[PDB]
Every structure is written in structure tokens, then in C-alpha cells.
Structure 1
Amino acid sequence: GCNKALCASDVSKCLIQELCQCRPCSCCKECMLCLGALWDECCDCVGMCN
């Protein structure tokens, strides 16, 4: 699932940077770099879980 309280700040950080906006894939890896440790807990927020 997508924890809104835990992922809201950092997920939005990657969106305004024009990342995590592709669909599965090209940007699937630059997106994971931006989320960092929160990749496991926030992949579902952008559907990049593979």
C-alpha cells in the first residue's frame, strides 16, 4: 500500500523534479534513486513496484 502520511513529502519531492512520471520502462530507475530508503514503503504511490 501507499502510506500517505509517510510518503507525501518525499513522493511529491520526486514529482516536481519531473521524475516518477513514466509508466511501465525508462524512468523507473531515476525514480527509485529519488525515493531512496522509502522505495519499499512508497513504490505503490507511483506504481513503480515491478
Structure 2
Amino acid sequence: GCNKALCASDVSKCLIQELCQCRPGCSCCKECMLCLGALWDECCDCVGMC
């Protein structure tokens, strides 16, 4: 579900910004989607937020 070739750049962009680092057990679940933008559908599985 995580296309590594398609999501490597943008997913890493949001990580170094300290986003997509919370766990759904949720606070950053929404700020993470904002950072990925159109790639949320194709890359949400890379961070387990869907």
C-alpha cells in the first residue's frame, strides 16, 4: 500500500518537519495529511495513518 518510489521524497519531507510522528493510540493525524496533500491517498500507508 506504500509506493516507496512515489512517496520517498514527500514522506521524508514531512518527517524531518517532525510531522507524521504521532501514533493513533490522535493529534498529528491531520497535520500529517496537510503536508502530504494530493499524495495522502497514495502514501498514507507509509506512515500507518489509514
The TM tier, using the shorter chain, reads over 0.9
The Cα shift of 1:46 comes to: 0.3
Question: What is the match of residue 14 of structure 1?
Answer: 14
Q: Structure 2-normalised TM-score?
A: 0.97
CA RMSD, 1 decimal: 0.3
**Percentage of pairs with the same residue:** 100
The Cα shift of 1:34 comes to: 0.1
1:46 correspondence with 2:39: no
Give, in whole Å, the separation in 2 of the partners of 1:43 and 1:30.
12
Q: Structure 1-normalised TM-score?
A: 0.97
Regions of 4+ moved over 4 Å: none
List per-residue Cα deviations over 1:1-50 (Å, max 9, x = no partner). 0000000000000000000000000000000000000000000000011x
